[PDB]
Amino acid sequence: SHIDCRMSPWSEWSQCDPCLRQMFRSRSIEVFGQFNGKRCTDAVGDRRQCVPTEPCEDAEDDCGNDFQCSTGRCIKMRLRCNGDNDCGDFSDEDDCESEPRPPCRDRVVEESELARTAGYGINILGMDPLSTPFDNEFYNGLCNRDRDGNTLTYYRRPWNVASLIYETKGEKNFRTEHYEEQIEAFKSIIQEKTSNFNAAISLKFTPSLHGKGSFRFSYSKNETYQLFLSYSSKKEKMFLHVKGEIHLGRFVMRNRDVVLTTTFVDDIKALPTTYEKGEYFAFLETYGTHYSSSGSLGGLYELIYVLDK
Amino acid sequence: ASMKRKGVELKDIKRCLGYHLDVSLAFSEISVGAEFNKDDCVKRGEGRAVNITSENLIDDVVSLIRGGTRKYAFELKEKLLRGTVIDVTDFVNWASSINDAPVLISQKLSPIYNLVPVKMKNAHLKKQNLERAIEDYINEFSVRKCHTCQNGGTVILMDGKCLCACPFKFEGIACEISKQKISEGLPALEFP
Amino acid sequence: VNITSENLIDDVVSLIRGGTRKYAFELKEKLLRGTVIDVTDFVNWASSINDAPVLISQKLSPIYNLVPVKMKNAHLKKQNLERAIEDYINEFSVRKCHTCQNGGTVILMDGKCLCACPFKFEGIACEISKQKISEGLPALEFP
Ligand SMILES: *[C@@H]1O[C@H](CO)[C@@H](O[C@@H]2O[C@H](CO)[C@@H](O)[C@H](O)[C@H]2NC(C)=O)[C@H](O)[C@H]1NC(C)=O
Ligand SMILES: *[C@@H]1O[C@H](CO)[C@@H](O)[C@H](O)[C@H]1NC(C)=O
Ligand SMILES: *[C@@H]1O[C@H](CO)[C@@H](O)[C@H](O)[C@H]1NC(C)=O
């Protein structure tokens, strides 16, 4: 069935955004098409430039607390020239009047390719997790030691990540099954009938006059019937599978009081407030629908086998 | 598990009839004769057989390990599973391996609201406040509040998904379909 | 009358992830019908996965709880995305698409609302069976 896509319910133009300078011609998806017919990937949402009518007096102040960064974030207490990379390679440490006091004296190697990138944007309707939606390099104060791992090396745990375990868990499972079915039936039927008949009558008369008569008759018949019936059926089924997961590490992102990246904050700053489903659906695909509060770095493998007879 | 049943039926019937009639009359000479003979036999036969074999097999295996460096730990894992040759050096390496990266085995528990620092700003009120929270937390969401599975399937909770572990002899989700299955037999004559 | 019929069905599936691409798929080739489990490949797989890991278990949390507080319009945008995340999961899914035949599990891969048909059945739309059925004609041949 060539099922078409009834995918054009249009809505009314909403009010223009003064600060964002965008319109919200809305739409909605109704029918996909279950068969080989016309594929329709038409995304929901529409934008348009509009002349702003409101003065746009509302603005984001620079936190009114301390030195503003070059992107919009703020120093809490010690984001000065103390080896704390938050904004850029030399953005925060641009002005260094005092001596470059190191925040930590011990040799602690940076988290290389490990759970450092703890942000993930998995889509429940989509696929495997996405990249990090927030900044995971900034740290608040004194380095928190991570003296664990396979070898003898010290890693760093960012202030955004609340925990980082190095448990090398490992497990596996296997299963098997066998089904068997057999049925046989034999039938045999035989019929036999035999028929024979005789008829003899003789006549003689002699009271010259003489008379002689003799009748003879025979009959032979048999009908043999034979019937044979046989039936046989066999069925077999096998089901077996195995799965294994080699766990490497585990982390738990801090829920509240966490720092974000300049790219995501700019998206939230340049974001509408009149329920723009079009941009929100567009913004939803960029950073996923929901992030991961706790993950498990590692890898798993699985094997599945089926058989039917 | 195995099941076998056999049934054999045989039926045979024979029945025949015999009749002989002969009449001769004599009476000047007159001769009258008569001869009637009847023969009829009947045979009936019937046969039936029943042969049904059924067998079921179930096997399950599971294992787990943790601790030590990843090299020595899983070298023990590969050789323990169906290896049948326990080595002397791998267990000694496992001893030095676990010394570097250990993990919990036995854990004695204690509530967090007892760990709050005393003589703080509002320590006591926050202490009992988290006490109400920790009591509500364990009683807010759990298997107790979810729905019960079928066929005694142990219900678990893994981040919203309230799945139930179904037994070995039974099939997967919702424990609805059995997958024992059941054998069907039709002795009807084939149409074509 | 002599009629014999036999049917056979076999299916196999496997997957793997993590570790460097050299050691990972070296494990893949030897596991599939290899029947000879090596000692060095699993040890190499141990060091391989240490370099490039991947998610196994993932605890989930909504995004609208991650929005920074005390922003310009944080609260109104928070509940606004809350209405969006609720509508998003309920806007397009298998629930709104059409149901397949013969209990075929329906999936959704970027618009294509295909349905996975069982093993004993044939492909798309689960219409044709492909069991097929045996036909017998005892008629005398014309020529
Ligand atoms: C039903 O019939 C099967 C026929 O396969 C029996 O299995 C044996 O089969 C061999 C070869 O076909 C015969 O030589 C044996 O005589 C059969 N065994 C017996 C005991 O007759 C099977 O045993 C029969 N009964 C059941 C319950 O399956
Ligand atoms: C005639 O009679 C004989 C003897 O009783 C019998 O065996 C036979 O079946 C009868 N019918 C014939 C010969 O057709
Ligand atoms: C019935 O007739 C068939 C035909 O030849 C013969 O083979 C068989 O022996 C006969 N049976 C009896 C009981 O006369």
Author numbering:
A (entry chain S): 18 to 224, 242 to 343
B (entry chain R): 344 to 535
C (entry chain S): 393 to 535
Give excerpts from the publication.
Although the chasm is sealed in the closed conformation, interfaces mediating the MACPF-rim and transmembrane regions are not flush. The asymmetric region swings back and meets C9 in a noncanonical MAPCF-thrombospondin (C6-TSP3) interaction with limited buried surface area. Despite a contiguous extracellular β-barrel, there remains a gap within the transmembrane pore where the shorter hairpins of C6, C7, and C8 abut those of C9. Therefore, conformational flexibility of the assembly may impact local curvature of the membrane. A similar analysis of the C9 oligomer from the closed conformation resulted in a lower resolution map. Using a masked refinement strategy coupled with signal subtraction, we improved the resolution of the asymmetric regions for each conformation to 4.7 Å and 5.9 Å.
The multiprotein membrane attack complex is a bactericidal weapon of the innate immune system that also modulates inflammation and proliferation when formed on self-cells. Based on structural similarity with bacterial homologs, the giant (110 Å diameter) β-barrel pore is formed when helical bundles in the Membrane Attack Complex-Perforin (MACPF) domains transform into transmembrane β-hairpins (TMH), although a molecular mechanism for how this occurs is not currently understood.
